[PDB]
Design a protein around this ligand. Structure first.
Ligand code: CLF
Ligand SMILES: [Mg+2]
Ligand SMILES: [Mg+2]
Ligand SMILES: [S]
Lengths: 473, 113, 465
């Protein structure tokens, strides 16, 4: 049924956002509201639209200036917070750019301040010729026309290419709106504005993977083994110009259908490129995905050679962890997709029972998926807040929580360990090896001497201090 | 029995597949029809359609489901061609009911992606 | 030809900002108050990114709420989001006593009437919760001026105005007020010990010691500010205010002097030996209490340690320092005491007209034997660009968002100020005072020693120093 938590008695609208799955229910009658307005004052986990455009998607690129048109806080706040390595020395993580909007620009306009900032950025780094400009709350409010500025800059500096995104933080309800605005502008303006050499009979784009701790580079070892050219990765370890070539691909493989389904849908509509959704987290999921890709291209035997070798290498370790993680209870409090990519994969491959899930910004689509794959007796929460998290912990008593670091540091006080469900502990987490990495971190998190030590009150005469015996795969 | 077989197929699709949960009504309808027509062909020994890119991708999705259904469900190797076709027609109807007709997902009919 | 020069950044844009915006600093002020949840009126990122920043520095959660400004409020105004946010906080957190209502760029631009919303909420709260008092403080923090440094100072001042307006002047407390500024829990622990050893009763505003909270057998959460409403109200009754940071709380000491005739004493921020000496002399002056022998001893232990390092490893080494202005100027003085040469000081905001009048600039101009460039309105690209152009540095002192500059230039780096997320435990280690000077000097030496080993630069010399 839908759940009114005790901490929500004075915000009872929250009941339509919380589903407890019970036997024999028609789940179509219990789909959480999602992607609706936030309640002020709740300590919702949500962020802003600008985050979704710059931090999550655009900022992944290795060769692009990320020009944040606004006061300096939006830039500061999106710098030193992500783990998306590159193969060019992590340019994307080393730098952030701001137009340093001041009061005079609120009064008189910020367009010349942006234009000056843009030329400064190109002058300071003469090897970089690509830029994305983002609006923020106050530059949207004063109506600066960043597309017009970018047009002038490209006319004046013909060796640069600039893309723009209107994504003030008050737009939409969450980071989701930023994903949409970026995806649709990119396909409208920049796809099919250049072409690259085709070097394989088999071509694809990989859509919705942001190279967290090297996930994209790990999956690329599969594509290289199979002889598949990836025209573009959207956007893990990617380049601006590779993204201009997306129309060339024969197939679009999607992992993050939430952030990046938009551009896969438009590529199908406009160019006829089929959309294949996979799960690139999960051991047996990865095997299904490879088999689908290889069935589409007609390279099935090459797929089976790769799968066989990967199972020989990694399955014994995975199964060692399953023996020790079987029956453990897990919560996932992340953006949305990882709920539906992980609930059944940890159950199948590790024996882990996901007892509570919260999505910051998922749509009803994401809830359809997670409730289809998820367990009975589990809580499914749209736009969860901090007091709800405490009440849910008391209800389901998880052994481990996959969530961000701040929430991990909060639940540590309750002696509940965490794995970073966003940026990972020791990743990558995608692919065959990656699920073994995920399992290792989960194992080390839960079977941790410090948790046992923390429970002992040395003043209690009746108590001793235990020793635990651990293991390794 | 025919309802038990259909329940088996529906529970498999719901917990495993993603193609019934695409972004818009028209894409869910296309995928339910396209994938399950290929599943029927593969479960009854017929030549799969692998001409156009879209047909090749319905084949890829269908191959996973046909292989899993044969592995999971002994009945799927016992029933005859007409019985498989009847089940898959019932499965299409059920998937349209739960993913389209009775889904409260409010984005399904938005004209723009 | 001996010159200390102040100059601005010569670019309009920023690459690699040194500080966050005003609202972030206001949030930091508020999280040091017991039974306080700041409410940040604006878009959601203005809250969530700052809660993350605090988790990076402290490895702890702190509670801050958002008003969740969305598109309708951007067209018609956001007052209803403030009013709802206050009530939703009050209804769900029964022990909540203080809500600084912090504006953002969005809500400053659209002109929401915060004081009008506070009158509405005060009426609503008095009717719904007759036996409760919640203090709503208006905090105006447009992000298109100043920085998190200015926002911290503005929030402290507004909270103090709000609470003291409510309670006024009472009986003399005999206590000092102390505004240390933006410092670590370890700095607070050191100051408490100094006042205890000198037999001086003092409130430290804010008392952030318990930000380093235990993981306890009973699963209790103790990660709170310790400064109470009562502690802030009692500021009106103090003997005197000791303000350690010109840019981080002195304006509250002045306000208490104007309003309640509590005399304010602004001293140099106590980085290094002389600044600590002068702080203790001012405490002695205003209290009539002697400096204890225990502080002479701690001072002497610090000096003994630093003397093992200064002429052997530090003399003539060139240092760049960035961070909050009080920290940068104080650390430049400390550096000089140990024979380091702070040739480049970077201060990260638009407060140059104030920095040009800071008396510590003159203290530098009258002491340094090497040129000093002080770049105000600086970003961290200002440091990287100068290194790329040939500036030879032996050491960088600054916060963790400068790390890649040091790593790529192969320059040892000591983490100071805020945030220091890329090393463990630094929030627990004092930087001010005698012990802090010693700890800083030994961090510098140990960073140099590791660098000598990794680069094979006379690594054999670390035997009989
Ligand atoms: S929702 Fe920016 S952090 Fe804010 S007070 Fe403005 S400078 Fe500072 Fe999102 S786009 Fe940005 S992060 Fe917020 S302002 Fe809006
Ligand atoms: Mg089921
Ligand atoms: Mg000694
Ligand atoms: S979000």
């Amino acid at each position: 049924p839908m759940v009114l938590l005790e901490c929500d008695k004075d915000i009872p609208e929250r009941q339509k956002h919380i589903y407890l799955k019970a036997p024999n229910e028609d789940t179509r009658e219990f789909l959480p509201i999602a992607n609706a307005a936030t309640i002020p004052g709740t300590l919702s986990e949500r962020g802003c639209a600008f985050c979704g455009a710059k931090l999550v998607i655009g900022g992944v690129l290795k060769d692009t200036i990320q020009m944040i048109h606004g006061p300096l806080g939006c830039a500061y706040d999106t710098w030193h917070t992500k783990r998306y390595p590159t193969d060019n020395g992590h340019f994307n993580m080393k730098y952030v750019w701001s137009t340093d909007m001041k009061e005079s620009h609120v009064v008189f306009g910020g367009e010349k301040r942006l234009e000056k900032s843009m030329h400064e950025a190109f002058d300071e780094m003469p090897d970089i010729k690509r830029m994305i400009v983002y609006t923020t709350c106050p530059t949207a409010l004063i109506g600066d026309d960043i597309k017009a500025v970018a047009k002038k800059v490209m006319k004046d500096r013909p060796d640069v290419d600039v893309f723009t995104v209107e994504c003030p933080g008050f737009s939409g309800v969450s980071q989701s709106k930023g994903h949409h605005v970026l995806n649709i502008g990119w396909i409208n303006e920049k796809v099919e504005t250049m072409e690259k050499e085709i070097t394989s009979e088999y071509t694809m784009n990989f859509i919705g993977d942001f190279n967290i701790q090297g996930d994209t580079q790990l999956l690329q070892t599969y594509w290289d083994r199979l002889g598949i050219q990836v025209v573009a990765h959207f956007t893990g370890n990617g380049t601006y110009d590779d993204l201009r070539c997306m129309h060339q691909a024969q197939l679009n493989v999607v992992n993050c259908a939430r952030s990046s389904g938009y551009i896969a849908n438009e590529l199908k509509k406009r160019y006829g490129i089929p959309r294949l959704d996979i799960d690139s987290w999960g051991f047996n999921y990865m095997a299904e995905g490879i088999r689908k890709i290889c069935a589409f291209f007609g390279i099935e035997e090459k797929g089976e050679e790769l799968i066989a070798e990967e199972y020989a290498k990694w399955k014994p370790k995975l199964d060692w962890y399953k023996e020790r993680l079987q029956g453990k209870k897990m919560a996932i409090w992340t953006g949305g997709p990882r709920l539906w990519h992980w609930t059944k994969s940890v159950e199948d491959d590790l024996g882990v029972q996901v007892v509570a899930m919260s999505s910051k910004f998922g749509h009803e689509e994401d809830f359809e998926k997670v409730i289809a794959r998820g367990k009975e007796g589990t809580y499914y929460i749209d736009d969860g807040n901090e007091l709800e998290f405490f009440e849910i912990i008391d209800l389901v008593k998880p052994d481990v929580i996959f969530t961000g670091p701040r929430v991990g540091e909060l639940v540590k006080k309750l002696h509940i360990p965490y794995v970073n469900g966003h940026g990972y502990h020791n990743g990558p987490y995608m692919g065959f090896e990656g699920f073994v990495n995920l399992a290792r971190d989960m194992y080390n998190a839960v079977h941790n001497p410090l948790r046992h030590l923390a429970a002992v009150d040395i003043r209690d005469k009746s108590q001793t201090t235990p020793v635990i015996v651990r293991g390794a795969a | 029995m025919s309802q038990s077989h259909l329940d088996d197929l529906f529970a498999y699709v719901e917990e495993r597949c993603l193609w019934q949960f695409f972004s818009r009504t028209w894409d869910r309808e296309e995928n339910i029809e396209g994938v399950l027509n290929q599943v029927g062909r593969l479960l009854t020994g017929q030549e799969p359609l692998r001409g156009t890119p879209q047909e090749r991708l319905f084949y890829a999705d269908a191959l996973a489901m046909a292989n899993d259904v044969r592995e999971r469900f002994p009945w799927a190797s016992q029933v005859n061609k007409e019985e498989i076709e009847f089940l898959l027609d019932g499965l299409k109807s059920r998937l349209v009911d739960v993913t389209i007709t009775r889904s409260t997902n409010r984005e399904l009919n938005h004209h723009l992606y | 030809p001996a010159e200390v020069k102040l100059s601005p950044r010569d670019r309009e844009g920023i690459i690699n900002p040194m500080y966050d915006c005003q609202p972030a600093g206001a949030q930091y002020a508020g999280i040091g108050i017991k039974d306080c949840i700041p409410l940040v009126h604006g878009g959601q990122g203005c809250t969530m990114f700052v809660r993350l920043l605090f988790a990076q520095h402290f490895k702890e959660n702190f509670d801050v709420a958002s008003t969740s400004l969305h598109e309708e409020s951007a067209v018609f105004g956001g007052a209803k989001r403030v009013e709802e946010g206050v009530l939703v906080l009050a209804r769900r957190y029964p022990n909540l006593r203080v809500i600084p209502i912090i504006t953002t760029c969005s809500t400053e631009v659209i002109g929401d009437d915060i004081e009008g919303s506070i009158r509405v909420c005060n009426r609503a709260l008095e009717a719904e919760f007759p036996d409760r008092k919640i203090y709503l403080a208006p905090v105006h923090t447009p992000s298109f001026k100043g920085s998190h440094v200015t926002g911290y100072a503005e929030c402290v001042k507004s909270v103090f105005k709000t609470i003291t307006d409510a309670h006024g002047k009472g009986q003399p407390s005999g206590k000092l007020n102390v505004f240390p500024g933006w410092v670590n829990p370890g700095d607070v622990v050191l100051l408490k010990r100094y006042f205890k050893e000198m037999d001086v009763e003092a409130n430290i505003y804010m008392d952030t010691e318990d930000f380093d909270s235990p993981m306890l057998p009973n699963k209790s959460i103790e990660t709170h500010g310790r400064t109470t409403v009562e502690d802030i109200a009692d500021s009106a009754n103090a003997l005197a205010t000791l303000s350690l940071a010109r840019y981080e709380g002195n304006t509250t000491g002045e306000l208490l002097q104007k309003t309640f005739a509590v005399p304010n004493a602004l001293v140099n921020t106590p980085y290094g030996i002389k600044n600590t000496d002068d702080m203790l002399r001012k405490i002695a002056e205003v209290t009539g209490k002697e400096i204890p022998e225990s502080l002479v001893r701690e001072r002497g232990i610090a000096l003994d340690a630093l003397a093992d390092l200064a002429h052997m490893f530090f003399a003539n080494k060139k240092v760049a320092i960035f961070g909050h202005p009080d920290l940068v100027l104080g650390l430049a003085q400390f550096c000089m005491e140990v024979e380091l040469e702070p040739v480049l000081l970077l201060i990260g905001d638009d407060q140059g007209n104030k920095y040009k009048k800071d008396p510590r600039i003159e203290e530098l101009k009258n002491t340094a034997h090497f040129d000093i460039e002080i770049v105000h309105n600086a970003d961290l690209w200002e440091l990287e660009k100068r290194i790329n152009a040939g500036l030879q540095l032996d050491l960088i002192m600054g916060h963790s968002k400068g790390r890649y500059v040091a790593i790529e230039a192969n320059i040892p780096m000591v983490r100071v100020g805020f945030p220091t997320f890329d090393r463990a435990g630094l929030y627990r280690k004092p930087s001010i005072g005698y012990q802090g000077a010693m700890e800083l000097g030994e961090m510098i030496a140990n960073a140099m020693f590791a660098h000598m080993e990794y680069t094979r630069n006379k690594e054999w010399i670390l035997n009989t120093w």
